[PDB]
């Protein structure tokens, strides 16, 4: 008895993620199926309803069900629509939309995070004993240069419809409370190029010249070069945290600053322990030497042990 | 005989925390219920009646009574609208809705600060009179991924269902003044994280280091060293300041940052003291070493009394 | 003949104050009453019309006057609209709004300026011969959580009805061309707090610690020193430009940066002097020694006439 | 044949100047007088049609004309429409409007730049010979205290009907091409104290304060120093960059920041040369002694010839 | 059968490029060509139909086709609409618009790239066999060689009609899945005079003063200096990024500044290989030396070959 929707979904773009909403924008086409009763048109040939007039053939009954995106924020903007009027019964909704649509996004493993974009499609009012959508299918295109593109989408878009029973209800009349619901996954990784080259290898290369602070000849030249090497990390994080997504948490970037932050306190502490470790307070030869290339080890060891 | 509405809210998604205008984000449904003059509908199933056309059933006189919410900044983002007319008198009016809600919020404990989301939800133009809030529910989804959000939910929702008096109206005739006011809160709080590793942390490290300056043998060394660090605090506080929400009031880290401030100027007003102090202005280093650990304690100390 | 009506304005909130346009957004009720020809209502009971409806009745010819506020900026977002219509003849309009208003706005006195917003309303067709104001109640909240609001309400709200006499005309007999016009207006101050702790304090203790360069002993050390000082001022000037209000003209924290560049540009300029005043190169060591307390005196003293 | 179109335009308003789009924003009213067809009106006074009401005038065949304004931006925001329709055959229209406009913009003099802010209107549909503009008036407020303002208006506001000929239209149709176009010019500064005391100034002073690196008496100390210079310049240029209007190419402070730039590679290419140039690798202090007025010169000289 | 469509698109404005969403604004005229049944119009003159009058007439059964922009972002600011109907069948829809339109941009050989601006135009619900376009013409302003302007336009615009073949939906013998779309292609510059300037030039300057460390008599000062050094070329990243426009790979300029982190981190991994070499713990003058404009070639010429 319910009516059989048959839903198609063209995406033509995917931009505009927000890592702080946890949004999302797509850009696509709609497109819904189904049978009714039989209409004459002008000719036996199909009618094509565009735009304003659809309120029109609403106004004076036509059926045309809602279907509201789950997940999107805010109402989408629609551009045109179309209704095609078969007079076998049959009529096609097809309208253009551009929404925020949200999902859950962890980017903590940035700039080597997985996402993947989402839409989920529901009918308002009417639940499965009254309106089921039949089938779902999803098109994408091919995007040929990828580079261009920040995101890479990888692998054919995922469909499956499915039923959501909703427990806090009007009426229960126990079997008018399941909706029929399409869901559309695309999965997708970062292009983690830019974010490589520019931000983490010069981390490295400033990380790596901290340590050659130890091989100043002085004390007070060790000492004093920390202060420099302090600020070149601070003015860095500067750097990353004004350019870089805004977060909730830590990403492997904001980690290996910090990891910078603590190799020159760490530094400090042995620079100032060197120049009163023996008695004398002679300047430590001994143990500088070999922290030059040890916390080149050590800090590569232990922060060589980050997988979470 | 006032109306008795029954009110439901859904609530999907509070984002968007905006800290100086003292808002934040709502999506979510809300479902109002009421009975009135039964009927006649097709066939003796309820009738379904969906966005524009809701418009056109108030034409003919039926009454869809306002509800404003009453701490929304401009007007909501409203998605599809449904009203459910039964056959047996009542009445359901389901719609989705996007909104900029106001509450007073106290950002001085960031960022480690409670806050509660708050609805108010109230007729705009009938009273309780006419028409009363019977009753609210209120419902969330259960959070696993906590993480990844930047708020922590506490608590299931609280109700409130009150009357408010307003003394200003103009055919008063004080008995038909008051409004039926239905109040929802959310009590959330601040998820740390980024703000503990990224922020908190590394000032620490930076006014800690700062102290090692005493460790500088010569004066000449410690006097240049301590305007390199005024610069690092100096770097730092314009890092904080981009990044961190913008207030009206200083927070914690901005007395952090007051704080790392004051420790340098203070040693400064002693480097350079010591260079004059008992009889025959000796160079006496006999000050630093006793402030090597005087006031890394002095500052942990004098700093370790603030509980505001 | 000419109408009279009645306005009262309540405010719920003035926020979202814009430096550089000059204008502020205002969250409200407007209310206006006027009495005509008396009418026959369902009962003898009032009659209300929300939102949608209102468009019906004036369409037969029901009477609802403009009512423009003057000095908005674009046309304001309109939320729920409600007309009350007695059978006594008499009429209430009361409609929410949000909108963004201009004003003149000084900022010189920054962060101890004052300021006040203002409305003005004003019939947008009818002259005072046909519709007259007859008077103006405003309402506002009691502020008890004073620090959480950026800006402090100092005042309850002035108000002021007047006629504005139009210079241009294309209706004949010339006493066609004046409006009646409520005025009102609201004094508030910005919340110093922020700025003195994050911004002023540091500014005096780094333009102080600037002074300390004369307690270094040698020349090289002298110079050189000023010239990390110079560094600091810039990227403080930096800091307080991007978290500032960005302006057309100069506040006292810009003024006080200039003079920070001052103060080291002098010092520079002295350090050099004293070093090539006297004969046989022998230092100026008195000019240095002099100066200790001569710029710590003459720009804590130069800087006090900025009585403007 | 053609009618008779009388226009006037109220400006509040000029702000919110976008320098990359070249676009500003607009506040005013805009007035249209023709005559037409006579008409029975209630009583022998004029009748007023607000907002709403005039869609309904024009569905019983109004001539209401479209008037569009060429060079905005997108569809500006129309606030209260009027029509005023005389029953001696005229006819006025009175709306307000906020909109932003396009106009060619040179801002390589700046802060020194004058612009002209422009309105340019005409008809959508309808030529010369149908539709015709008579005559326009501008009116324009004097404006009580200047610096308040970012731009000062230099004149009165110029007018200028004309008629403008497009070559490839409608069919062929010769001789009915030619729009009736008004067009608005109105000169203005830009008030440009803050430029001068918070950039223009300070970075004299830095590039000043530059040139005394050549006051080191060693040659290690010149060239380090330099650095430190060099860095300064960098964060000058970004104080600037972010704070100042971004542009695609270079202006008067751009150029000063392009001159610090080389005034430093150059001193360092001095610096490092005397220390080389005689035999006994001589330090040639001969030469450095000689800089230190030569650059304040010959930096104010081929610099000074900035006549762009 | 079908019906020919003949295209008129005028240019105004192609501006405000968001490389980020890899799209661009357009304003312009669109007009439209086609003729139809004849019809009796006032007098034998044609008929002009203005903005909400069109949906009047398309109401009684006026054909006014969609016409869809392919490749836009979200529905266009559509300014007025205009008919004009002729007594021999034929029809003409004039509108402006404002749009924001997406093409593939590579911005990788930026600032010396080179895009095409494109519009792609397509009817929304009729096919080929109902509606066909029969020409396409594009008018474009002529100004040339402009600084005012970010891009050199390269020529007039070049244009494609052709048929799309849309592999799905439910067809008639299957020739009912072809649509006429016109495509209009733009090609453009970017100017690269304020990038060379201002950006280009300086990172030269400071790359190669960065390699004067050579010339350091100390190594002291040799390897104390290159960690300065280091900060600089951190505070022209954080300089370039925040002003250039974001993109998800490395350009130019980006790798200029990687190159510049390296030329300072090898020259650390030297001034440091130098002073341990040999025997008898001697200092290294020879390779120091050697190395001085061995850098400047070996940067100079090994950099001086890259051609992506
Ligand atoms: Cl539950």
Chains 1, 2, 3, 4, 5 share one sequence.
Not at 6 to 25: A, D
Not at 194 to 213: D, E, Q, T
């Amino acid at each position: 008895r319910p009516v059989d929707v048959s839903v198609s979904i063209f995406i033509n773009k995917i931009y505009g993620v927000n890592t702080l909403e946890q949004t999302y924008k797509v850009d696509g086409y709609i497109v819904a199926q189904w049978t009714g009763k039989p209409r004459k048109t002008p000719g036996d040939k199909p009618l094509i309803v565009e735009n304003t007039q659809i309120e029109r053939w609403i106004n004076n009954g036509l059926w045309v069900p809602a279907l509201e995106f789950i997940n999107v924020v805010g109402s989408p903007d629609t551009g045109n629509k179309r209704l095609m009027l078969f007079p076998d019964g049959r009529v096609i909704y097809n309208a253009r939309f551009l929404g925020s649509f949200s999902n859950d996004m962890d980017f903590r493993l940035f700039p080597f995070d997985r996402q993947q974009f989402v839409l989920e499609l529901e009918p308002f009012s009417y639940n499965n004993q009254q309106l089921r959508f039949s089938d779902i299918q999803v098109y994408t295109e091919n995007i040929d240069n990828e580079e261009i593109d920040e995101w890479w989408i990888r692998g054919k878009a995922s469909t499956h419809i499915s039923d959501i029973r909703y427990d806090h209800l009007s009426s229960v009349q126990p079997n008018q409370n399941e909706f029929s619901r399409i869901t559309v996954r695309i999965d997708a990784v970062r292009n983690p190029s830019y974010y490589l080259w520019s931000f983490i290898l010069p981390l490295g290369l400033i990380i790596a010249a901290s340590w050659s602070v130890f091989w100043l000849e002085s004390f007070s030249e060790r000492l004093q070069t920390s202060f420099t090497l302090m600020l070149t990390v601070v003015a860095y994080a500067f750097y990353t945290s004004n350019i870089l997504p805004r977060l909730p948490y830590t990403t492997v970037i904001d980690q290996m600053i910090i990891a910078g932050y603590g190799s020159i306190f760490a530094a400090i502490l042995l620079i100032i322990f060197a120049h009163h470790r023996q008695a004398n307070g002679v300047e430590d030869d001994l143990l500088i030497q070999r922290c030059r290339l040890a916390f080149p080890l050590g800090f590569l060891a232990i922060g060589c042990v980050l997988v979470i």
